[model samples]
Target: LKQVEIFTDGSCLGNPGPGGYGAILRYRGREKTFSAGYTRTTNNRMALMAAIVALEALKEHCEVILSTDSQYVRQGITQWIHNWKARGWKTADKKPVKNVDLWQRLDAALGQHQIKWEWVHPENERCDELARAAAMNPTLEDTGYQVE
Candidate 1:
């Protein structure tokens, strides 16, 4: 079984200032760590981006065991996504959800992969360090409409 293990973390210098996402893909003792920053973004967006990038990196369909440090990312993807999809991305109340762009991207990125999600506390995690440092190195790349 070629299950891939991914550890992800997200960070922000200020709530809506600079943000970054970090992820490490581990497979059969091989590891690849990657991170990126956004000029204006939120921690939630960073978290979403982290998961999206980790899943998208795989060249083919895979068994993905992905971990994250944010419940916003975990619960949103695993719990809320189905209903959000059924209701046209609306919550229980008739209202549009936030971060629609990233949410859509993450959902579609699940293509053909078998995935399991785990939540971990961001204590002395290496991915956390990467995200924090990357956030400081803000990039000018467009982060899409600001909604977190």
Candidate 2:
């Protein structure tokens, strides 16, 4: 099993207005970065898209370690994921999941590989610089910090 690093961030100019998601993926001595904005979307929606897109970018099976600051993304995988599955993909209260579309996409992508996720503080944490820089600068998006 190999380890990979992923960091993602999402921002919305308004709660339900223009939004964007930025993601960075480091693996096998290579890196991939990507981002896009929506004309109308929420911050959480962008966060979910960042995760979904990162997972979807993989082209092969391997052990993955994804780090994100969004609890929505982290908690779903660590805790709520199974409960949702057990409830037939519904929430505990029986209402349909809010981000079901992205969740389902991420869920299916996970089946193709093994992943371990870690939650880190949004900024000022270790390697936080990369995540922050990636989010703000599209030009530096997918550059690998692999010289270590």
Candidate 3:
């Protein structure tokens, strides 16, 4: 069984300001890096998108270990999602869950693979650099995708 490893990070200028996500995927001896920036977005959104975009880029289903610095992303998928789904996507307070769209997209993509969601230290530099670079400079390469 081929196992894919991914490192992801996200950055935002002012919580809801310009933001970006960076992800590095490795399978076998090959590696590819992906990133995108949004004109206005949240760090949590960018963190989740980092994982979402990485998985979306895969050509085939495989065992995946996706590591990210955001507990928001990791815990949401691994722990909180169950409760959210059981509650019809509502929070404990009956409030509508945020980022439902991206969560749905991520859920769909997640079902296609066997994944081990891992959380890394926020101090990780390489991934941090990638994410910050994209957020700080939106024109680095591709604008990637936009989120409403």
Candidate 4:
């Protein structure tokens, strides 16, 4: 099966200030850049939105490699998922997960395909650079980061 690569990143001026996310989806010989900004959001929400939008760009169930700098996205899928599902999608102490909305959407997308994910360290990497650049100067689109 042919494989596709997805790189995603998010940034926030302040933890909850103007935030944005960037995603690049690449396959065969075509690629697309996606970006969006929000008035008030967090880095985690932006990261999750980036990956979700990237996956939503897929045409079919193709082998996918999702790379991101955020450990929340990585560990959320790698480790916390099973526990979250078992706990009725709640966190420890029986509290509701903070980003249940995004998590739920991500979980559905995950179940729909086969994916390999890595917790990439974006301290100073090229893919990281791309996402960072796009996010810092985001192009307003409907990547679902809009705030009321």
Candidate 5:
């Protein structure tokens, strides 16, 4: 299977404020950077959006190694998601899961690829800077471009 590596990060000016996500996708020897901002969103939503958008950009199914600084994104996809599905999308306490929309979107996009989730350390600051820059300019539309 062809393999791709994606590094992603998301940030919000406030817990529920201007937010954005950044992702770097590496396929073969090509790299693509993508980012988007929202006037009002949560950090978790932005994090989920990063992965969802990256996977959506693929033209075909492939093996995906997704790296993210948010455990919310990593753990939900790798572990907690199974229980949520089995419980009909409810949490352990039986409360409705948060960010269900993004989760559903991520799950649907995920169907097109084989994925491995990796948690990145905060010390990996490049993606974090991209995410923060995106949030700082919340009006900018989503953008992507190829690079070395």
Candidate 6:
């Protein structure tokens, strides 16, 4: 399998306001970058989108190392998802999981890759810079995020 490195980050201006996600993917001696803004969303939502979008970009199975600054993301997928799934997408406390749409998409994105989560690589800062810049110019609303 091809070896790939993915770095990602997310930004939100007001916790539940304008948000964005950024990611960089390197493989086969080349790198591609991605970024997008949301008119309203949370940092975690953007974080999920970062990983989902980057992983989904892969055209074939690969050995993927995904780096991110968000512990919520690193641990969310690595440590929490299994239990969440076993519980039918409910938290330990039985609360419904948030971002089910992105979570499901991310699960699909991970389907073809052997992925390892790396926490807080410096490249994630570059992702953050991209995300913050995108956040400032959000072009779409996150339809999955409840407005109320």
Best by lDDT: 6
Q: lDDT per model, in order?
A: 0.83, 0.68, 0.80, 0.76, 0.80, 0.88
* Model 6 C-alpha lDDT versus the unseen true structure: 0.88
lDDT of 4 by residue, 36-108 (tens): 7766677888888888888888878878888887988887887888899999999899997777888888898
Off by over 4 Å in 5: 92-95, 121-124, 140-148
**What would the per-residue lDDT of candidate 1 be over residues 1-148, giving only the tens digit for each residue?**
4788888988988878788888898888998888998888888888888888888888888899888869898788778989999998997897887888889889988765888877764422888988998898977564574544
TM-score of candidate 3 on Cα atoms, chains taken together:
0.84
Q: Which is the better candidate, 3 or 4, if ranked by lDDT? A: 3
Worst-scoring 10-residue span by lDDT in model 5: 139-148
Q: TM-score of every model?
A: 0.88, 0.76, 0.84, 0.81, 0.83, 0.91
Please give, for residues 1-148, the per-residue lDDT of candidate 5 as tens digits: 7899888888989877788888888888898888878777778888888888888888888899888878888788779888888998998899988777778779888889998877755423667888898898898532221111
Ranking by lDDT: 6, 1, 5, 3, 4, 2
lDDT tens digits, residue span 1-148, model 2? 6667777777666666556677877876787876775555666777777777888888788688777778787788888878898888998789888777777878888897787777765322423343333334433211111111
Rank by TM-score, highest first.
Answer: 6, 1, 3, 5, 4, 2
Model 6 TM-score is 0.91
lDDT by residue for model 3 over 16-121, one digit each (tens)?
6777888888888898888877777878888888888888988888899888779787778778888988998899999978888788778888898999877655
| Candidate 3 positional error at 88, Å | 3.0
Return the TM-score for candidate 1, rounded to 2 decimals. 0.88
Model 4 per-residue lDDT at 48:
89
TM-score of 2: 0.76
| Alpha-carbon deviation at 56 in model 2, angstroms | 0.9
